[PDB]
Amino acid sequence: ATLKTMNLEKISALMDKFEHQFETLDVQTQQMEDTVSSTTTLTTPQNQVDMLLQEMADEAGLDLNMELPQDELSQRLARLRDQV
């Protein structure tokens, strides 16, 4: 009975839909987060966050610079795609 009212083709479809719908929800949460980020932009200046990270890194002895921006197979295959 159950395999008739939910056959494999119908599961195929339901699964596809489930996947695609959670992609739209991910698109939705990104744009909510982006909006809150800009709304509260003056309460979190970039330079202040960078300096607090640098202070906390220096106190931890971590050799990293926090103001600056921070595989081979993928680069090889990219070069193959160029070379063809």
What does the binding site for other proteins look like in residue numbers (CB under 8 A)?
A: 8-9, 12-13, 23, 26-27, 29-33, 36-49, 52-53, 56-57, 59-60, 62, 64-65, 67-70, 72-73, 76-78, 80-81, 84
Whether 55 and 49 have beta carbons less than 8 Å apart is answered as no
Tokens 């200046």: give the residue.
45
With CB cut-offs between 5 and 8 Å by kind, which of other proteins, a second copy, none does residue 6 bind? a second copy
C-beta closer to other proteins: residue 5 or 29: 29
CA torsion angle for 35, 37, 40, 45 (degrees, to 10)? -150
Residue where the block lists tokens 């083709």? 9
